[PDB]
A paper describes a structure:
We prepared the core TFIIH-XPA-XPG complex bound to a bifurcated DNA scaffold that mimics one half of a DNA repair bubble. We imaged this complex by cryo-EM and solved the structure at an overall resolution of 3.6 Å (“Methods,” Supplementary Figs. 2 and 3). The cryo-EM density was of high quality and revealed DNA and all protein components except XPG, which likely dissociated during cryo-EM grid preparation. XPB binds DNA in the duplex region, whereas XPD binds the single-stranded 3′-DNA extension, consistent with translocase and helicase function, respectively. XPD and its associated subunit p44 move by ~80 Å, and this requires a flexible connection between subunits p44 and p34 and rearrangements in subunit p52. XPA forms an elongated arch over DNA that bridges between the two ATPases. XPA binds XPB and XPD with its extended helix and its intercalating hairpin, respectively. However, in our structure DNA is held in a positively charged DNA duplex tunnel that is formed between the extended helix of XPA and the XPB ATPase. The tip of the XPA hairpin contains a conserved tryptophan residue (Trp175) that stacks against the base of the DNA 3′-extension at the junction. The plug would clash with DNA in the XPD pore but is displaced and mobile in our structure.
Author numbering:
A (entry chain C): 18 to 100, 108 to 125, 145 to 242, 255 to 289, 307 to 458
B (entry chain E): 8 to 73, 103 to 120, 128 to 151, 157 to 285
C (entry chain F): 4 to 65
D (entry chain D): 55 to 240, 278 to 334, 343 to 350, 359 to 387
E (entry chain A): 71 to 199, 266 to 645, 655 to 720
The structure:
């Protein structure tokens, strides 16, 4: 998420971050419902309005949406108290954004992006590039446990595969930025270049990495100016558990076969079936069923996207109901101590056990206290010394 | 989502009157209030649409169709072309406005129309003004309005049949701050914010022969045509 | 003081574990002490061989 | 198109209104669809009227007087759910009460009675067959909606005075019968337009947010947009002959000579009801 | 390429897209060619078979009308394993004809070169005794029809009824009072194709015109019909549907069900049952003189109601006792266990018309059913004994579940407050008593009578006070159950997907909706997915209600554990 990353940051970088058209429009584009209204209202103001009038601009109904908005709005340090004038590094550059101060494009963008997603499955046309191979492992979606000729795929790597196309691109860039503090450049110029792409010497090396996932295009082996692609902006399912996907690409076939089993393969159409024994093969690695319905709700046919609610509700709960078979019997381990002749001394052992957070379950019939074995070493020190 | 049509009263008689009145508010400082609110509607969401219609005498061109720097040069070129039967026709532009909303709603959305009226209300179009209101009411299209000099009688009914707002601004050069506060929020955020209430509603009817506004008059019972104080016979049927 | 771990499940599924206690299908003292009709204390070594007994019973009525 | 109407609604209040075969109270399912009936009557007919008479224990008592008040009727039908409804009804006493007021209306209207009738027996102290010669003389139009059977009076009262007699299949047929009684069958009044909030110009009396008549001076107060929806039926727009760049949406009329597309053509005649070029 | 909404698979399977502009002119083509396998709301799936093409060329389309219109609606190109199969199974149709004439059965061929091929099989030489003919025995007509399919020269039963000049053409005329819906007009058009009647099987829902098509087919051939049925109640309906829509006097509509016998010798329409014509014991004297009359008269249009019981051992001997020219079969649930529905393709003929069960719902001919498989958890005292025994005593345990007793009592209360007509179908008749006396509700126990069976059923329809009824295995046919609105099915037979399409027949005769009570984590969970296997192939969607809408708040039975301990001691005492 973007406001998750921008919330936990220093004030000394956000003032540098607010670029001339780039970041001031980008942060303002992601503000929940009402934070866009107050930023617009006091954009042309110069005298700071009183801080108590802001809560009076909202009805008493839907007041809980006010504090979560201004908490995020003051969390990014857009205004301050000052006695609520906006930041002059933000109010000026946002007012610059209000007018102040190629069929080869998309086909290159999709093909250069599937060969990165093909690296997380079995394919002979692997993205042979030593920079990306260490990049995916330090992000935590390619298990190695060995130098190895093949790299494996962890449980988080399967969850990466069934995300949306823009949503899986942001998860990659946040783990590019979190590691670039100690191996690359400053955080300010790399993040302002991405937002300026959406509308120094170290930046060509970052541009040569965006060349490989596919967000720019050179066409003459790193010329002066680049050209951005469509990736740089930021299948029916029926009642009888059968899905008819119209994709002919090999990447979309291996994503469907992760959680279903296939029974025919025509050109330009592949029919599979969501069986019970194949969803249980998916959650065994753990691709849990909320991501399954989210994978089918984004990728859908226009005939699915009709006046009916998409992904009809007898198959969406059934995948949730097939998730709960793994759930029956929960494996939470503990240890036990009992057999006191007195009916009072175990009640004094409650007051020495709740405050650390070790007690798991309480029984008042036979006075059965269960604690975790990681926390069993400290509870016995009170019992032998009274 | 959130298609917003702006209908600006581009009557060259009243703006040219204020251009010689020296009231420090010309047409140029009013289209700037349209262009900034035009640019500000394209910021609150990624997929937001804009349309600007200029109401001239005997004609009415679309301004914006024919990132924001590709929007603002079209508007300043069309206004420089249009401003180069002395009463405005606001009803002919809202009929064009509902056609553009009906086309963009077929290619997919809630929409609204914001009218900035600057001339006096012509009562000669009461038969056609009410038809574009009831067409807007059955498609849940709000008709917001702000006036500059005097309360338009026909335009107050458009904001209460459909469900929009009506605000007479006190000052001309403070228009841009007023637009952002009371019209820049969309339909859902308008319920959460607090806004000025409607101060007066002006319901009248036009006579068929006089086309005059009437508080007490005679209606026919079969053809339902309201007449002024005559009652000699049923003129329509 | 005794060494043993916990398992919590549906009370309908809980009595299946009590059936495996008094039928000697897996071990002898497989449940150390029943604490509740919703929670069960089992021994820590047979926690994995128990899992395919439940997974077969969920697949015996597929 | 249509005419003015002065409809009366006679509601049966007999012992047989406690019967089943309907939503919990046979009386209650009658009063449920009547509240739906008053709304759709006043919507399609702007300046008409409704009286509601309830007959009970060989006598008729007027529940609501004849006035065009689309709020006073529904707020009185909600009160009458807890009615006793004992005894046998009448039909001479109920059509005469609906004749002492409905006769003196002017002759340019369509005076009507609508009887919703569940009992089988009309114990009334005189001859019914002299009313049907009187109601036919006064140009009233009595129509009955019958429940569970067909009575001989309600056929000869309907076909002589001019109305219809109909018997219920079920509740889906009972809503279908009341729906057919809102269309009017094919003068100069003086109403007072109530501008300024809701105040009366003739007597300057301030009252509630209503399309109702004024009690202090007797004037009827209507709202001109409500009258305005009934327009465009008279002089509607003629269709176009159809054989890119448009005039409506900007992306063929025989009057203004401005071309349309297909979405625009269907939109002009369906909802807009005017030609967008002709208003210029 | 974006058009032509099929995908002809190389073995044979036709994936039709039901969102195409030319779907209605490609769904009116695949009914005449293939047979439906699955029909969801988006992509249908038909299937080519051998018997489905014999019904294709029986209608006026030849072998070049099918194999060309597959190319023009292909999306792939026909895969050349279908051009070899369509040509093989269409040029061998009209070569060997089975025609009867005055009480003798004849195998006829116009081409003499196939009779010299046909008369070397050692089983067709057992059934013996231009225009080459040889007379075959009547009692070996079933073992003959297996062999003609076994060597791919199948028999056709096309009655040419327009001019025969032997049968006494009766005055049955369909009166202009019964107008038939546009799916009934399409099924009869595929039957009476070339002006000659055809022996097929028409699958229509029981709430649809399952009987109006049988009457209209009787007024069309206008020969001596013979209606059969599964029960003595089902023939008093067939008698009523002939007087309602066909203008026949009571001196011609007779019966043969051992109680009326309305002079069954010498009539025009005889409405009898199964197991009366195939009663293999010593018959009574009134039935002996009718069967001696019925075994010697050539009928026309035998109407076999409830076709899915014909491939039984005793009900398929009816088709050799009675001599009919054409044999129409009307059913509602064609599925049946033990794999004998493919055996029915030569007892009667090819499957003519199957109604689209979702097209009749979207047009208003069938009530919109909201199926809901509400499953109940098991009680912890009952599951203690469920896993301890295996020999059939646990069938009572997953039937008399106390937590399933609450969901039956709650769903009855929830629909009595909405004035809904409740039917509780419940087999395993010990738990019929213990369910219907703890709620004080009537029950058609099954060995009750003929008397109080008729008045409990009539106190259910024309009375707004008695609202529920507890049937037990009686309503598994086309009985007169009077238009229910919900149906709380509890613990029926094992995997009978014929049953839960006959329990569904009561509901469609949301508007109406039926439940299916399951005791979860038992053997009934595996059963209740075997029985929705037929209904999900028609378009129906079975929801799951794990927890009901506030079950614990009302006054439900079996609250305490003391009253629950007594029920287990009642169940376990049976043994
Ligand atoms: Zn006048
Ligand atoms: Zn008139
Ligand atoms: Zn007054
Ligand atoms: Zn025109
Ligand atoms: Zn157009």
């Amino acid at each position: 998420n973007l406001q998750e990353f921008l919330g936990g940051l220093s004030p000394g970088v956000l003032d540098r971050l607010y670029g001339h058209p780039a970041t001031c429009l980008a942060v303002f584009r992601e503000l929940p419902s009402l934070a866009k209204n107050w930023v617009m209202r006091m954009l042309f103001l110069e005298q700071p309005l009183p801080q108590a009038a802001v809560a009076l601009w909202v009805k008493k109904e839907f007041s809980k949406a006010q504090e979560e908005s201004t908490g995020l709005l003051s969390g990014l340090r857009i205004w301050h108290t000052q006695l609520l004038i906006l930041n002059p590094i933000f109010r000026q550059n946002l007012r610059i954004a209000l007018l102040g101060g190629v069929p080869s494009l998309d086909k290159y963008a999709e093909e250069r992006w599937e060969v990165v997603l093909h690296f997380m499955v079995g394919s002979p046309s692997a993205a042979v590039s030593q920079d990306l191979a260490q990049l995916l492992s330090q992000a935590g979606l390619m298990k190695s446990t060995e130098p190895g000729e093949p790299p494996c795929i962890t449980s988080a790597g399967f969850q990466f595969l069934l995300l949306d196309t823009p949503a899986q691109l942001w998860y990659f860039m946040l783990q590019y930025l979190q590691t670039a503090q100690s191996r690359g450049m400053d955080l300010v110029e790399i993040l302002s270049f991405l937002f300026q792409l959406s509308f120094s010497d170290s930046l060509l090396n970052f541009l040569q990495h965006l060349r490989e996932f596919g967000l720019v295009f050179q066409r003459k082996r790193k010329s002066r100016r680049y050209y951005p692609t469509r990736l740089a902006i930021n299948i029916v399912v029926e009642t009888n558990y059968r899905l008819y996907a119209y994709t002919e690409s090999e990447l979309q076939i291996a994503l469907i076969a992760l959680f279903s089993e296939m029974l025919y393969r025509f050109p330009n159409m592949v029919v599979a079936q969501v069986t019970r024994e194949s969803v249980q093969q998916a959650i065994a690695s753990g691709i849990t069923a909320q991501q399954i319905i989210h994978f089918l709700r984004t990728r859908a046919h226009p005939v699915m996207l009709k006046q009916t609610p998409v992904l009809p509700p007898t198959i969406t709960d059934q995948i949730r109901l097939w998730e709960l078979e793994r759930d029956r019997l929960r494996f939470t381990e503990g240890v036990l101590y009992n057999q006191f002749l007195s009916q009072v001394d175990f009640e004094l052992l409650l007051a020495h056990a709740r405050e650390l957070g070790v007690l798991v379950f309480e029984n008042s019939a036979k006075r059965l206290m269960v604690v975790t074995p990681a926390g069993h070493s400290d509870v016995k020190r009170f019992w032998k010394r009274q | 989502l959130n298609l917003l049509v702006i209908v600006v009263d581009a009557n060259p008689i009243w703006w040219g009157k204020q251009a010689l009145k020296e009231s420090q508010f010309t047409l140029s400082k009013c289209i700037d209030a349209v262009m900034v609110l035009g640019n500000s509607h394209l910021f609150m969401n990624r997929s937001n649409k804009l349309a600007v219609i200029a109401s001239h005498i005997q004609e009415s061109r679309f301004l914006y169709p024919g990132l924001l720097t590709s929007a603002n040069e079209v508007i300043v070129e069309e206004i420089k072309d249009l401003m180069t039967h002395t009463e405005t026709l606001l009803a002919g532009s809202l009929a064009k406005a509902l056609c553009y909303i009906h086309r963009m709603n077929k290619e997919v959305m809630k929409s609204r129309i914001l009218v900035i009226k600057a001339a006096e209300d012509s009562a000669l179009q009461y038969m056609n003004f009410m038809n574009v209101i009831f067409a807007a009411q059955k498609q849940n299209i709000l008709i917001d309005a702000c006036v500059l000099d005097s309360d338009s009688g026909l335009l107050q009914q458009a904001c209460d049949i459909t469900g929009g707002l009506y605000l007479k601004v006190p000052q001309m050069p403070s228009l841009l701050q007023y637009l952002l506060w009371v019209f820049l929020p969309d339909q859902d955020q308008r319920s959460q914010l607090i806004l000025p209430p409607p101060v007066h509603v002006d319901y009248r009817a036009a006579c068929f022969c006089h086309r005059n506004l009437i508080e007490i008059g005679y209606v026919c019972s079969v053809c339902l045509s309201i007449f002024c104080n005559f009652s000699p016979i049923c003129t329509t049927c | 003081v005794l060494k043993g771990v916990l398992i919590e499940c549906d009370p309908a599924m809980k009595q299946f574990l009590l059936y495996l206690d008094e039928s000697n299908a897996l071990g002898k003292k497989f449940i150390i002490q029943d604490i509740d009709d919703t929670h069960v204390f089992v021994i820590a070594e047979l926690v994995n061989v128990l899992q395919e007994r439940v997974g077969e019973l969920m697949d015996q009525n597929a | 198109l249509g005419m003015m109407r002065h409809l009366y609604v006679v509601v049966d209040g007999s012992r047989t209104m406690e019967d089943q075969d309907l939503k919990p109270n046979r009386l209650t399912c009658t009063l449920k669809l009547l509240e739906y009936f008053v709304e759709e009557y006043f919507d399609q007919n702007p300046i008409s009227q409704i009286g509601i008479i309830v007959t009970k224990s060989k006598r008729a008592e007027k529940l609501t007087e004849l006035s065009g008040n689309p709020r006073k009727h529904i707020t009185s039908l909600k009160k009458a759910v807890d009615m006793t409804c004992h005894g046998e009804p009448s039909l001479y006493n109920s059509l005469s009460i609906a004749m002492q007021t409905l006769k003196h209306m002017p002759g340019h209207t369509s005076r009507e009675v609508l009887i919703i009738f569940s009992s089988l027996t009309t114990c009334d102290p005189s001859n019914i067959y002299d009313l049907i010669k009187t109601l036919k003389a006064a140009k009233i139009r009595v129509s009955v909606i019958g429940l569970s059977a067909e009575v001989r009076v309600c056929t000869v009262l309907a076909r002589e005075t001019g109305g219809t007699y109909h018997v219920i299949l079920d509740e889906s047929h009972y809503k279908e019968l009341l729906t057919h009684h809102v269309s009017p069958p094919p003068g100069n009044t003086e109403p007072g337009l109530t501008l300024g909030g809701y105040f009366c110009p003739q007597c300057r009396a301030k009252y509630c947010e209503l399309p109702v008549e004024c009690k202090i001076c007797g004037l009827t107060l209507v709202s001109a947009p409500h009258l305005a929806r009934s327009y465009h039926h008279l002089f509607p727009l003629d269709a176009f002959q159809e054989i890119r760049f448009c005039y409506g949406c900007q992306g063929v009329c025989a009057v203004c000579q401005n071309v349309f597309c297909v979405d625009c053509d269907v939109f002009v005649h369906d909802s807009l009801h005017c030609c967008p070029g002709c208003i210029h | 390429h974006t058009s032509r909404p099929l995908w002809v698979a190389p073995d044979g399977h036709i994936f039709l897209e039901a969102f195409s502009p030319v779907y209605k002119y490609a769904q009116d083509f695949l009914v005449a060619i293939a047979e439906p396998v699955c029909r969801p709301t988006h992509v249908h799936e038909y299937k080519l078979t051998a018997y489905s093409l014999y019904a294709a060329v029986s209608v006026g389309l030849q072998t070049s009308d099918i194999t060309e219109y597959l190319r023009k609606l292909s999306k792939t190109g026909v895969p050349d394993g279908i051009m070899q199969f369509i040509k093989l199974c269409t040029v061998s149709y009209g070569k060997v004809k089975l025609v009867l004439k005055h009480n003798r059965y004849f195998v006829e061929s116009c081409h003499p070169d196939v009779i010299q091929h046909l008369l070397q099989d050692p089983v067709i030489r057992e059934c013996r005794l231009q225009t080459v003919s040889f007379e075959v025995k009547q009692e070996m007509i079933e073992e003959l029809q297996k062999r003609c399919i076994h060597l791919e020269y199948p028999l056709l039963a096309e009655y040419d009824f327009r001019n025969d000049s032997v049968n006494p053409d009766i005055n049955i005329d369909l009166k202009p009072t019964a107008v038939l819906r546009p799916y009934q007009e399409k099924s009869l058009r595929k039957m009476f194709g070339n002006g000659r009647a055809r022996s097929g099987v028409i699958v229509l829902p029981c709430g649809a015109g399952k009987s109006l098509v049988g009457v209209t087919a009787a007024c069309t051939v206008r020969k001596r019909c013979l209606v059969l049925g599964n029960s003595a109640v089902s023939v008093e309906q067939w008698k009523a549907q002939f007087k309602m829509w066909s203008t026949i006097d009571d001196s011609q509509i007779c019966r043969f069900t051992s109680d009326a016998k309305d002079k069954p010798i010498g009539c025009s329409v005889a409405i009898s049952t199964y197991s009366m014509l195939g009663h293999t014991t010593k018959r009574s004297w009134e039935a002996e003189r009718v069967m001696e009359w019925l075994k010697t008269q050539e009928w026309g249009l035998m109407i076999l109601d409830e076709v899915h019981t014909i491939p039984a051992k005793m009900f398929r001997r009816v088709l050799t006792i009675v001599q009919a020219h054409c044999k129409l079969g009307l059913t509602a649930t064609l599925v049946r266990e033990d794999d004998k529905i493919v055996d029915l393709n030569f007892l009667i003929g090819p499957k003519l018309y199957e109604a689209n069960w979702m097209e009749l719902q979207n047009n208003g001919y069938i009530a919109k059913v909201q199926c809901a498989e509400v499953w109940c958890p098991m009680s912890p005292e009952f599951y203690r004994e469920y896993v301890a025994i295996k020999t059939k005593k646990r069938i009572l345990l997953y039937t008399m579940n106390p937590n399933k007793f609450r969901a039956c009592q709650f769903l009855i209360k929830f629909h009595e407050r909405r004035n809904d007509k409740i039917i509780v179908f419940a087999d395993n008749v010990f738990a019929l008593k213990e369910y219907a006396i703890r709620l004080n509700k009537p029950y058609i126990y099954g060995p009750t009578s003929q008397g109080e069976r008729m008045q409990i059923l009539q106190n259910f329809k024309h009375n707004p006070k008695i609202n529920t009824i507890f049937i037990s295995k009686v309503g598994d046919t086309s009985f007169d159950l009077p238009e229910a609105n919900v149906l709380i099915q509890i613990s029926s037979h094992g995997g009978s997907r014929r049953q839960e399409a006959q329990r569904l027949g009561r509901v469609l005769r949301y508007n109406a909706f039926f439940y299916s009570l399951v005791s979860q984590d038992t053997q009934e969970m595996a059963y209740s997915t075997k029985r929705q296997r037929f209904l999900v192939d028609q378009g129906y969607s079975f929801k799951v209600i794990t927890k009901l809408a506030g079950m614990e708040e009302e006054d439900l039975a079996f609250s305490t554990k003391e009253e629950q301990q007594q029920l287990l001691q009642k169940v376990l005492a049976a043994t």
